Amino acid sequence: GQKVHPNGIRLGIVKPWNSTWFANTKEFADNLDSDFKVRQYLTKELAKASVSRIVIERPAKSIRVTIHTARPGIVIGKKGEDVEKLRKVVADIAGVPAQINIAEVRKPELDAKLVADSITSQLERRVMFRRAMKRAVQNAMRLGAKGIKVEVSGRLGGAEIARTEWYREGRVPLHTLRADIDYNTSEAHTTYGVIGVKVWIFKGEI
Amino acid sequence: PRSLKKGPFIDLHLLKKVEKAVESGDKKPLRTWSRRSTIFPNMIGLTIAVHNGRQHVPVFVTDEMVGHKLGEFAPTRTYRGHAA
Amino acid sequence: PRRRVIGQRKILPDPKFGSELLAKFVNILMVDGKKSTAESIVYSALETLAQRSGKSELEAFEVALENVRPTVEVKSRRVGGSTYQVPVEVRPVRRNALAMRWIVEAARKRGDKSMALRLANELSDAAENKGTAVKKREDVHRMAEANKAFAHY
Amino acid sequence: NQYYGTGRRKSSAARVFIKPGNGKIVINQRSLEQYFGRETARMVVRQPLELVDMVEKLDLYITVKGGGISGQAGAIRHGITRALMEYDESLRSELRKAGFVTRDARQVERKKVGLRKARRRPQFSKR
Amino acid sequence: RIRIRLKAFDHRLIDQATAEIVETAKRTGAQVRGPIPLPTRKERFTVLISPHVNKDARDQYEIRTHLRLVDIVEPTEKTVDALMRLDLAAGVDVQISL
Amino acid sequence: AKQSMKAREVKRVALADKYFAKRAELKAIISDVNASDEDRWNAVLKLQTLPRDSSPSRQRNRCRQTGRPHGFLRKFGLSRIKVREAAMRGEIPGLKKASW
Amino acid sequence: ARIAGINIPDHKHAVIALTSIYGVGKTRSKAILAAAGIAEDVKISELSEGQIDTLRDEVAKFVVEGDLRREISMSIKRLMDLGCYRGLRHRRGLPVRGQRTKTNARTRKGPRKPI
RNA sequence: GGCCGGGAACUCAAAGGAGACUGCCAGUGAUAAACUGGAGGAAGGUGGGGAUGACGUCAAGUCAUCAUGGCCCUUACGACCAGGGCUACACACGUGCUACAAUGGCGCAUACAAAGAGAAGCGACCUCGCGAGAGCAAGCGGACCUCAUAAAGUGCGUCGUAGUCCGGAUUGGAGUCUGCAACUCGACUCCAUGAAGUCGGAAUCGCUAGUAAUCGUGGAUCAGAAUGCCACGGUGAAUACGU
Ligand SMILES: [Mg+2]
Ligand SMILES: [Mg+2]
Ligand SMILES: [Mg+2]
Ligand SMILES: [Mg+2]
Ligand SMILES: [Mg+2]
Ligand SMILES: [Mg+2]
Ligand SMILES: [Mg+2]
Ligand SMILES: [Mg+2]
Ligand SMILES: [Mg+2]
Ligand SMILES: [Mg+2]
Ligand SMILES: [Mg+2]
Ligand SMILES: [Mg+2]
Ligand SMILES: [Mg+2]
Ligand SMILES: [Mg+2]
Ligand SMILES: [Mg+2]
Ligand SMILES: [Mg+2]
Ligand SMILES: [Mg+2]
Fold this sequence. Notes:
This is part of a larger assembly, with seven protein chains of seven kinds.
Chain C (H helix, E strand, L loop, with lengths): L19 H10 L5 H19 L3 H10 L5 E4 L10 E4 L2 H17 L6 H12 L5 H15 L7
Antiparallel strand pairs in C: 1-2
Helix pairs in contact in C: 1-2, 1-4, 2-3, 2-5, 3-5, 4-5, 4-6
Chain D lengths: L2 E7 L2 E9 L4 E3 L2 E2 H4 L3 H8 L11 E8 L3 H19 L4 H6 L30
Parallel strand pairs in D: 3-5
Antiparallel strand pairs in D: 1-2, 2-5, 3-4
Chain E lengths: L1 E7 L2 H14 L6 E18 L9 E16 L5 H5 L9 E5 L1
Antiparallel strand pairs in E: 1-3, 1-4, 2-3
Chain D binds one RNA strand through strand 1, strand 2, strand 5 and helix 3.
């Protein structure tokens, strides 16, 4: 059957929102579109900086963006040079004075977004899919995850018949609402079409 | 129906075409797509060719058609019966 | 059902006479949750019935019930493509339920103008073995008697 | 002095104040016969007092809101049963034996997606 | 008097905001009442979850808008400015009435 | 949606913004309880001359991310599909799956 | 007993009895009875002949019966001669006010005609 | 007239807590799991309802939400416009609404909800109109103002079993509003009209309790345009021997 989104179902229980601002109906759609444009620019311009999460806050007539990256050096750049350009473009997109903050992701092997992104980048480089999957699972389990599941689906290895393959180690108790499940996805654009990747990472209960 | 406080509706271009047609004395069939314009008293005696979707059909305006819309006299759908 | 956790629901007695049986009768008469309407019909019919019989409301109601309550009915059982109408005893609560249902059904097909009048007429007729409710009881008894041989099924 | 009780049933909530008196009942500034005209509803309200044999020994001032006739009458019995045990704790057993102490927790079941009602399902057809 | 109204989609957050606001009015020596917990608004959204057909397949969502009222009764001449400098958390909407 | 369809939407919004004042003027007159029968009737006729796409009723709400013309929600400016995708990622503040 | 060239029921209340006239519904019936000083729950039998002449004069102010039938026929016939869409719908015996004809439309079309 | 001063009790609002565990008692049971019953308790054995959908299955649905391999078009399979169509109508099916009446129709009077929405919005009061509505114009970004009197119900009267004082289709006339614009093809009002239908063949559907049935109310979409959908209360059953 179909499964509920592991992040969404936990959104007020053990997982936080990625956008935290109040708005009435008058500004809500505008803020949604502005957030979308900000995230799309930051995702394109930092595609080589292992960005896992962009948190957007709008305190009062301003925007505060927190970029969660495993490689803060490439984003901060040569003495703030890069974050300055990013802040300028973000303030221009949002139409309000922007502030950009950097939060370092230690253990990129343990956060689902970066794991999925690495798998998809490997697939686009024609790395054998089983190898990328098994290595992701092994790295996560060695770094202390209580469980990880990796799923890859599409024309695997260029096969005409698409299929889905998945590996699991440890516990991934998706029905447990308090379970801290880090979930994310990524797509690989191979010469045979799109291969979708899904990563679940269990990091303990409460 | 259109509210009486608004008056009847007619497209400006067709109103001018008709005004010229009454002035020149003309009886050359008037080509129009304004199926939505009301038929006015000064249209009487004129021939208005009203578009029906694919062709303009000649409508020779009489006294009785005043107040109607031009499109009421240009059927748009073609039907000859089933099992015909 | 298969599991059997199923037990009486608490029934409030009718306000005028404090009769649980009469409350069940009102429920059987009720349509579309319109309990006050059904109560008015039942009280009007009972008052007419007591005026016509001189007994009382509850006693005339009981006397009508006694002539419609069945004692034996048939339950179908398929055996060899043929179904065996097996006569079974009717337990007391079901006797009352069937009698009230039959009385209401009979009164609904009568020709009198108001339902209260139809119900009073049906109760009067049943008090002396005349209405179609008593006819239905007689038919059920005769169908059960015709199958008395098939009592082990 | 007054003895208080809160009664609830369906969407109704009732505030019941009782005191020693001669049997006055007032609900929302109206007489019991005026507020309720349904015979089932005055009887429910009367059920607790005519069980502790005090139909005329306690006065009754009542307010109620929410729900309809049966909801408000049940809210009131419940709230009188709570007022009676404030007056005297010894008749709690007799009130609970009659089922008056229980808060009837039955509520309207929500409508659900794909159903016409809480449970009524759209008519089905094989073909 | 000052009427402070606060809206938020998270109560833990509002319950922290409304509370700073009170001190800032009780350090300038100003009397206050509440927080008043005003009714929460639940806005619901029912959407189809298939891209195509499957009308009975739906998700139901809701945004809960929490609301607190805190009243400043007779405010010392630092109340407003202080009040207008606490700098409450992002995600809380603060509307100050006078 | 096609690029041209989104473009038509942009054009309609811009034109309605341009002519909002003129259309409002022309209508409190065709409508007025006291206006010449020619002044009211001259407004009926100047109103048709303004471009059709300046009428705000020509605008169709579209998903701001895909252009979908069906399943729109005004609160989010998105169709049902994109609303769900953003909701599950925690990108719509305060929004979560509801039960009651 | 006799108004507008037709007989009206003597056993009925006046408001109900007056509706037997083609062109008099309930609203016109109440207006007629109010303007003739006659109560509404009065049976036609228990009315003086003078009251009936009052009712006749009141009915005379409205177009009813054969005059109304001629008016309605003239309007339809004008539509049909005109050849407008409404008149063509009248010609074919199909719904005239824009209703669906893929299904239903049985009041205009009549009983089902098997292929 | 909670109307005013007040009061913080109560309703309620909404934060934090308590509460239910086969925990206690009796019996049965394999010194078990468990089951049957009892007490207390607002609630009793998963208390009620929801969300939550394993590995997989049907090359199931979706290239027209989006994305995307390949293929194909490129002064056209791209783009713009006006008018038409998607609303056709011998016919067959699915899902609904309204009925066929007296447990009702109509008239007068008069009780009791919940949930929700609102700024190019909700729009009061007052005046005008039979009415849909119109004019003037408060208040409200809302526990405050508005949508917005719930309806069934109850009391009194009438109708008296008639194709009717049932039903409200169809059609004629006259209008309102939205909207550049209601001919094709809007909704609604008024006057007139008053069809089929008198409980539905074979067959077939839902529902185990605040359920079914019945009665109103709101919302999204939306300029306008629900009998659909989603949501909300009111009244409130019957039955379950058994497999
Ligand atoms: Mg595209
Ligand atoms: Mg539109
Ligand atoms: Mg139509
Ligand atoms: Mg027990
Ligand atoms: Mg579970
Ligand atoms: Mg297929
Ligand atoms: Mg296709
Ligand atoms: Mg269609
Ligand atoms: Mg009628
Ligand atoms: Mg709305
Ligand atoms: Mg609100
Ligand atoms: Mg017939
Ligand atoms: Mg009949
Ligand atoms: Mg069940
Ligand atoms: Mg309904
Ligand atoms: Mg609308
Ligand atoms: Mg309901």
